[PDB]
Amino acid sequence: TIKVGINGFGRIGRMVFQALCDDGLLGNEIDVVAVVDMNTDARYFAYQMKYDSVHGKFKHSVSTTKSKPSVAKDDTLVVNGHRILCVKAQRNPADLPWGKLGVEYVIESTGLFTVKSAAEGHLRGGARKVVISAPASGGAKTFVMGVNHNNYNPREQHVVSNASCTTNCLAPLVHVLVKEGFGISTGLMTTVHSYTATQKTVDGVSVKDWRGGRAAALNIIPSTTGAAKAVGMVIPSTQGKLTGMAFRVPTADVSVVDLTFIATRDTSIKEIDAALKRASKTYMKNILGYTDEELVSADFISDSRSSIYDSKATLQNNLPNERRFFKIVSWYDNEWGYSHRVVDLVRHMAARDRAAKL
Amino acid sequence: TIKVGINGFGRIGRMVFQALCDDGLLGNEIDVVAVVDMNTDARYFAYQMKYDSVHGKFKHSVSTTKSKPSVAKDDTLVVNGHRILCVKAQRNPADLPWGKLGVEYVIESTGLFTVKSAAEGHLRGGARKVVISAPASGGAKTFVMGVNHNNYNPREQHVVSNASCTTNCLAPLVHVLVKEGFGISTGLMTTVHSYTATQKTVDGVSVKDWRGGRAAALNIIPSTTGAAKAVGMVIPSTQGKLTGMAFRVPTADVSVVDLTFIATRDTSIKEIDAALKRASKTYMKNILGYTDEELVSADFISDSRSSIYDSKATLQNNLPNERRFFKIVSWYDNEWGYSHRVVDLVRHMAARDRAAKL
Amino acid sequence: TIKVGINGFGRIGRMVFQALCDDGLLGNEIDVVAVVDMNTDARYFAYQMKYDSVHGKFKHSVSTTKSKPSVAKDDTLVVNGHRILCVKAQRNPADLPWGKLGVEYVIESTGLFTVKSAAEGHLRGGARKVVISAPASGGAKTFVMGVNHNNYNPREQHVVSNASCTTNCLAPLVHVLVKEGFGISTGLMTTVHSYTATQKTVDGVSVKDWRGGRAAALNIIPSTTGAAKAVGMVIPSTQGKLTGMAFRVPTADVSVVDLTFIATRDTSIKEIDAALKRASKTYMKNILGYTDEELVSADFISDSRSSIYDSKATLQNNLPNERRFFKIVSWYDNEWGYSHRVVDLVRHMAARDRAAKL
Amino acid sequence: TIKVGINGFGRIGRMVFQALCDDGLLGNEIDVVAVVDMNTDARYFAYQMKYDSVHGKFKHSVSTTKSKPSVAKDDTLVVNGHRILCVKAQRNPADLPWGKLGVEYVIESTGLFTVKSAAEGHLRGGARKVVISAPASGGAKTFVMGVNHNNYNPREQHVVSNASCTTNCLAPLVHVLVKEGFGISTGLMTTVHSYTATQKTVDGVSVKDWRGGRAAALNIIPSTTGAAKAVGMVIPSTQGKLTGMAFRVPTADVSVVDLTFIATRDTSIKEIDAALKRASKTYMKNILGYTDEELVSADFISDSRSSIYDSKATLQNNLPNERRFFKIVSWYDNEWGYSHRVVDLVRHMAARDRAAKL
Ligand SMILES: NC(=O)c1ccc[n+]([C@@H]2O[C@H](COP(=O)([O-])OP(=O)(O)OC[C@H]3O[C@@H](n4cnc5c(N)ncnc54)[C@H](O)[C@@H]3O)[C@@H](O)[C@H]2O)c1
Ligand SMILES: NC(=O)c1ccc[n+]([C@@H]2O[C@H](COP(=O)([O-])OP(=O)(O)OC[C@H]3O[C@@H](n4cnc5c(N)ncnc54)[C@H](O)[C@@H]3O)[C@@H](O)[C@H]2O)c1
Ligand SMILES: NC(=O)c1ccc[n+]([C@@H]2O[C@H](COP(=O)([O-])OP(=O)(O)OC[C@H]3O[C@@H](n4cnc5c(N)ncnc54)[C@H](O)[C@@H]3O)[C@@H](O)[C@H]2O)c1
Ligand SMILES: NC(=O)c1ccc[n+]([C@@H]2O[C@H](COP(=O)([O-])OP(=O)(O)OC[C@H]3O[C@@H](n4cnc5c(N)ncnc54)[C@H](O)[C@@H]3O)[C@@H](O)[C@H]2O)c1
């Protein structure tokens, strides 16, 4: 993909940078030109980059410098040799130095430009392709790697969406259920979810979501989800046969899916279980994973899979002799894996604008 | 019920004593003679009784003294005027002074005599009726109030069991389903549960449940449950049609039930909603309640209902135009409500041994 | 104080309204005319008023309505019979309808006009007396009740400040030290503090306090404090003899002060203990309290004292035979008590503008 | 040290094993023969060894096998090539197969044999030297590496103590204060401490420490310490000039020291600060560490120093122009570093019974 920019430098924007460093690609394949956020103090950025409450220390050298010598405060990050420019946040993306800086693919991480025309200002700033790191609205095309990232059309798709974190976990499960031919005549899902950057420490103000403003670490907070819905988007086979809800509980990372569906033919949990495990070793490799150990949420932190099927949980917990009525359980680190998928899409698209394959 | 004894004085045994007190029954109707635990320092008991990290300060006067004046340390609780005797914990219940203290109904709260013959040792110490405040085994009778407490037979049942907390929350749900004639042909359930006194603070030893031993306030911990199972005991109609699992999340009290079921004949969530709200006002009154405000877990503390139906959560989150495939959400304060049902059971059983009716 | 207005309706502004209500002063003595925040949906206010994750459910009747019937959504709170007006938040306080609504004492609770000229804009909107519910700057007068509230001068002070919470807890401590004649020649202090509405749930952006931005419920976070500092303002006697720091620990409410000081003339902790317990019963009554039970943080919730002296903790933990080198431990519910002092200050100031004395 | 046994396999016993693996010494220098705990299911042990809620995954291969082929369940751990025997827990250490198994130094981690004669049963089981991983009583000799581990006398000291975790953090600080000649005429200390394996998840039973049985993750719990006291033991210069207390707050690892002392000569914080930093690079190397970044508790997890001096915290927070009255701040991961020190003592002692130096 080579020339890359990053809009909004926190958590995902931070984990996204990090993945492409950890996967050894910075300055051989992907060239992060600049990052942009609510400032340009390059050493806060370096502080944020080295020390993380959940995922741990950065395993790389972080350094700072000034572009030009009339600056006041260092304005460039120098990660493992490479120079990335800190740029000053803008209320409207049209005012980004994209074309000038020499950026062609930009990655959206603010959370303020979900609507497709909004994010489209990046193109107008001389950016060339936009990937919205969340569920976009207004006719942006949604991709879920390993389920439908082959629909990507270099001529058609210009501002795209990489879906949600929960959509990315649910989608790979439904795909092999449909493809190996068990089916979903209908389905319902819960997600037990870690708290995020949009919750408050103490009872706060949330005038659209009343329940969401309440004290984050003191509660279980029922909440809504669009994850299922969007699946229909990515697998149009399944439109309006699925839905769900979310509970937010006081854990700082990692989350899980609880899927209850009715099948299209007579099976057993035993046969589904075996199908899944095997897609792990074949076509869904490195997207879908699986486990048969007795693990807890702590144990998937920094796990770069999109979806990890908990085998004993499922087998242990369905009705015996049943033929259609099944539940499935699947983990996912909501920051880490999704962030990898963001880089995965970016390389794919590039390669495909015949921006050199890999 | 007049003469009562309590075996194991913590959490449940503490909540249970407190219940009958707040419900004003101590010394008019129920007569707590003695309690027993891992000692006989009555002031540690009083300290334990007056201050609680979750439910708050005791609204009653606590006081200690000694039975006879050659004792060493006070051994009688003097609550709001009444004199309860602190009694020394025993490895074997057949060694309790039940007959002698003059105790006839005894409340098992240790967690150590769930097996019917074990818990029968109380009858052997001169005790007369024994309620197990937890799912028993070995042919002890299981009761759920407002669901089947009327099958109680003064002649037949002497060691009985008031189910579990989750069984007491799910049970009334399914009840009015079957009754108002919706049916459950097949059902699956999840409960997101607060942690308990059997988890560990840090990674611990749990050779029976490996996942249970992990650090409790740092994890989501999948776990099993017999709760649905036991429902078919209480409503035989539904034997072998129900099952589910639990998730232990880092909250100290309150929990929630997520039921997903398939109806027996066509309906709409609209009508199921209504039927549930009516049952609240009629036959299931004070057992099952409902809410249509935007409450979170913390809002259910010290709520003495068995099951509380969350209406917005439900209505918001089902499929449109659906006939048979439905999901229901119900809250419950896992300590409190269950402690009140325990008292409710003792009284019923009492009046029924023509131990004077109310 | 009769006519009152409140600026910023959360936590403190919510606790402050609640205080005068529980202390039965709404509509006899104090007259809350209007409140103002980031909107005017009076039912979100009522939802906010009735349910609290820490302090519990409102013991009063909450109700909403509209001022005039061309409004769109209810805009008046109707608490226990009284009609408060919801008023639209303003970037600049000189744009408040103070004069017009007929408001004379206004309570600043936003956290945005600490600078004396800024907070003076209220006088400019027709308001008459302004209390800053947080340490102010720029020559605003600082008061601490039961320590120096008597220096208040109806003619002199118009924009005033009720200190901080920690300043309100430490201050009374040092007071009776100096008075009973022990002296402080030099002192240092730590407070172990609960987290607040300015921390972040996950690793966040805090370019001013770098350590402050880190995940709040996962850390011990050293931090500074001006609390001792401001003490020399309130007791000038001790200027430049005090200082200390804070540690932010993962609890939602309540905090503690750990004072270490050097006396002016010989004594024993035994005598210091006694003097403190007496002051509780005499001149500092209702401000400073004490305890000699084995209470933990949770036991201080909704405790309306300014400072609570932990006697066992202190006596247990000083050097034997020591004359001058001493450590003192005092608790405090950082939200609640301070909200009550704020009301206490308004009344005092009121009566003093001969706004009728109590 | 070569032949080593381990009594009680959790947390320290686990972190102690782990250190000597991580420091590359298993089966070149230290030979762990067997471990012993509340069972002999070698694969739980392997589960406990690989997955840790706080510190992360084991970076090594874990495997299981049976000693002899009539066993029922694997009974040997096979870590990175090496075979360690799982042995069955005993109520009295005299009944350990120490001499037979071929063990000479054993490491005590149960917590049940602190009294010197109790732990001395290991010698009587054919063990040769005992190191109690905690503060022993009854005339065991206490060592604090890098402060007085040179007093060790191969002929005199047979059951020794490696002190406490807090004693290990405090001791290195006082040592360079005394040695560089600033002094301690007197001192007082607080420690803000992570919760441990002896706290309860919910209000529990703790009849010696009432405050310690309360709900661990919901409170700040004042507590007592012997740490200061024991310093006098290790630095007899300082006997009865020091004391302290502990607060336990809801964080699962890492803790910090707050030291307030009066010096023996006129100095400045600037000169102390410089002394410390420099002992880091000289004689106290790898025991005492230091930092001048803006870090929080999460950032020292798995930090193998005994004591880490927070430079900005101290400098930021003392009185200006002061000459005698000072506080110091210092971090420590309570499991990790202390566990390294345990191995450090063991090698030292060995080398010294002329069990071959290094
Ligand atoms: N963290 C997760 O679990 C997760 C998973 C999948 C998707 N997402 C999505 O990613 C997006 C970001 O989430 P987040 O948690 O990483 O957010 P943060 O972690 O809340 O990131 C937001 C950043 O935007 C910056 N910012 C705000 N306005 C800006 C502007 N005008 N210009 C530049 N920067 C600006 C902020 O300074 C901040 O650093 C969301 O929209 C969310 O839907 C999050
Ligand atoms: N609070 C809940 O979530 C809940 C709800 C429903 C049922 N229950 C059940 O009730 C039982 C008690 O749980 P708990 O939470 O109160 O446990 P705790 O809260 O762990 O109660 C146990 C008490 O029993 C005492 N004890 C142990 N052995 C004893 C003996 N031989 N004689 C006398 N006292 C003895 C202990 O000292 C302790 O005080 C369990 O079996 C549990 O399944 C709990
Ligand atoms: N609870 C405590 O620990 C405590 C104790 C003593 C003092 N204080 C102080 O009181 C102040 C408030 O703290 P807080 O905890 O209540 O904050 P919140 O709890 O964060 O309160 C802030 C409220 O102000 C509102 N607001 C913001 N801008 C506004 C505007 N321009 N007009 C009207 N309303 C506006 C916000 O919507 C929000 O509702 C702070 O300055 C703080 O220092 C807090
Ligand atoms: N974890 C810390 O922060 C820390 C730091 C310094 C010192 N320590 C000390 O280490 C000791 C252990 O603490 P811990 O937290 O690691 O304990 P755990 O983590 O509570 O370890 C105790 C182990 O002892 C085992 N056990 C009990 N009885 C036994 C027996 N008869 N034979 C063999 N094994 C037995 C248990 O199964 C358990 O695994 C304590 O005495 C404490 O003083 C702890």
Side-chain angles (χ1 to χ4, degrees), chain D residues 7-12 36-38 89-90 109-112 133-134 165 196-197 334-335 338:
Chain D
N7 206 288
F9 193 79
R11 288 247 81 66
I12 294 286
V36 8
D37 199 68
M38 305 257 307
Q90 293 287 30
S109 310
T110 50
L112 277 35
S133 72
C165 51
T196 56
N334 36 272
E335 323 192 301
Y338 175 87

Side-chain angles (χ1 to χ4, degrees), chain C residues 20 55 76 97 109 125 144 179 209 296 304 308 322:
Chain C
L20 60 86
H55 293 291
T76 72
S109 310
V144 168
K179 223 195 73 131
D209 176 8
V296 298
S304 71
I308 295 164
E322 177 58 53

